[PDB]
Every structure is written in C-alpha cells, then in structure tokens.
C-alpha cells in the first residue's frame, strides 16, 4: 500500500525559569520509531522501534545534532511570536511543527508537507507544490517574507522530494517484517439489551494495522447511519489498533442488520451478522 514518514515537534514555554519543554517524535506509517524529550536524561535522539537500532552511532549523533537545532529554533520562535502578538511573559504558549512525505504503492513521491501552528492555530504551511506558502494572518505574512527571502521552500522541497523519500524506503526495507506486514482486524459482534423492546449491537475490530479502517452498518442491505455510534480509532498499546461501531435495533430484528469492514489487510470486505 501507500506509506509515509512524519516528524512532529511540540515546544511549550515555561514562564519564570528556563527553556521550553520540547518533544519530538518520528513515525513511519502508524509506527513511532524515534523520540527526543528535553526533560529526559540522555539528551539524545532515542530508538523506539527495534528496526531503527540497526543504525550506527553516526546516525544517532547526526539526528541528535539536528533535533537539538530544531529545539533552539522553536525556543527563538516562542520569543518572536510573543512579540508579534503583543503577549506578556506571564503566559505559557505552544509552537507545533509537522513535516514529512507520502509515497504510493510504488514507493515513489506522492506528497510532501511542512506546517506550523502557534497556540493551536494555523500559522504558516508549505503549499502542495512545495514552492509557496499559506500564511494565516499578518504575523505569518512577515514570516513568509523572511522564508521567501531565505529560500526556505527550495531547501524543504529538496528534502521532501529526495531525502525524506530515500530514508522512508530505507526504513521500510530494514523494518520489512513489521512495517511491510498488514494485520487484518479480528472482528466479533456483541449484543446488549437496554429494555424489553430495544437492543444494542456492537461490531468490533481489534488488533489491526495500519490504523486506517472503515466500519459500517447496513439494514436489509442499505446503509444505516441513524441510531449508530462510531468511536475514534484507538491504539491497543502493542502497536495495533481498535475500533467499534454500534447500532440500536428493535429487539428481535437483529438479523436485518450487518456490519461491514474494509481494511488493507483484507483481500475482500468482511461481512458480519448477529447469529
């Protein structure tokens, strides 16, 4: 299937004393493989998947160098943004940056991303063409001019179209045993009776990977969204994911309803019926 690599960075200012709390994480698809946390003792980029541990000490030194440079950039940012927005030194504020690349089934470049937020609002983002910027307000416009003059888009496009995809292919190869394996959902249905006349049917999908999935109900072969509840997909904690969808039905009419499951790891969609 298609693949991605994404890096996520959060910095949170700490009024009164010291530098911001900084947390960086790297992902391949839905698998976290690296982390840096300013509050941790090692002060190094750290492995979070077995397959990245194959990398030598020079990988770790270079990643540590870059992640620390990212955190200083964000440190400076928090001060500049405080000034841009006319804010005091009393409040805690947040900067967030995400970047990375998407590749299709052929592992060739599809899309690249680099976007930035301040206090949880859109600030500046690289446009799909990797040549121009979307600045949300006048402060971000000032940043856009700064980044244009310094040719930031050109540097980023080179990374996203080349380096990002090159290393993605590397990680997918090295981590093939997990990263290239799909785990089809394990599915089952539960029944609960709220009253004499009403029942709840819950359709479960467990232990699946990747996270992307579609779960739906049909009544007598037609889509049913009314009287249904769908929970957010959630991590099991062992690298896999869980989801359920539930429908409220008249008691005795259970057999009319079917649950439909679409996932990359299923050659064909799955159908479940209450037995």
């Amino acid at each position: 299937g298609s693949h991605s690599m994404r890096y996520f960075f959060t910095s949170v200012s700490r009024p009164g004393r010291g530098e911001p709390r900084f947390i960086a994480v790297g992902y391949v698809d839905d698998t976290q493989f690296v982390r840096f946390d300013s509050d941790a003792a090692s002060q190094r980029m750290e492995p979070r998947a077995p397959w990245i541990e194959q990398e030598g000490p020079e990988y770790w030194d270079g990643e540590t160098r870059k992640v620390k440079a990212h955190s200083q950039t964000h440190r400076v940012d928090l001060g500049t943004l405080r000034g841009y927005y006319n804010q005091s030194e009393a409040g805690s504020h947040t900067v967030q940056r995400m970047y990375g690349c998407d590749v299709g089934s052929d592992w060739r470049f599809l899309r690249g991303y680099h976007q930035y937020a301040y206090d949880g609002k859109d600030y500046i983002a690289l446009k799909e063409d990797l040549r121009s910027w979307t600045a949300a307000d006048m402060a971000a416009q000032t940043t856009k001019h700064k980044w244009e003059a310094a040719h930031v888009a050109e540097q980023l496009r080179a990374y996203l179209e080349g380096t990002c995809v090159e290393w993605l292919r590397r990680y997918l190869e090295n981590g093939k045993e997990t990263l290239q394996r799909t785990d089809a959902p394990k599915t089952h249905m539960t029944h609960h009776a709220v009253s004499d006349h009403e029942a709840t049917l819950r359709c479960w999908a467990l232990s699946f990977y990747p996270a992307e999935i579609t779960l739906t109900w049909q009544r007598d072969g037609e889509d049913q969204t009314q009287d249904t509840e769908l929970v957010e997909t959630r991590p099991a904690g062992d690298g896999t994911f869980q989801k359920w969808v539930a429908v409220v039905v008249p008691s005795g009419q259970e057999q009319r309803y079917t649950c439909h499951v679409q996932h990359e790891g299923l050659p064909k969609p799955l159908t479940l019926r209450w037995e």
Binding site: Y7, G26, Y59, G62, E63, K66, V67, A69, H70, T73, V76, D77, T80, L81, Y84, R97, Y99, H114, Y116, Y123, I124, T143, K146, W147, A150, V152, A153, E154, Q155, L156, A158, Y159, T163, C164, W167
Partner: peptide, 10 residues
C-alpha cells in the same frame, strides 16, 4: 532522517 536545512526561525 530529520531535515537539516530549511528549518528556520519565524
């Protein structure tokens, strides 16, 4: 692998 260049202050 993280980006080197192109990560600039606002």
């Amino acid at each position: 692998e993280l980006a080197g260049l192109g990560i600039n202050t606002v």
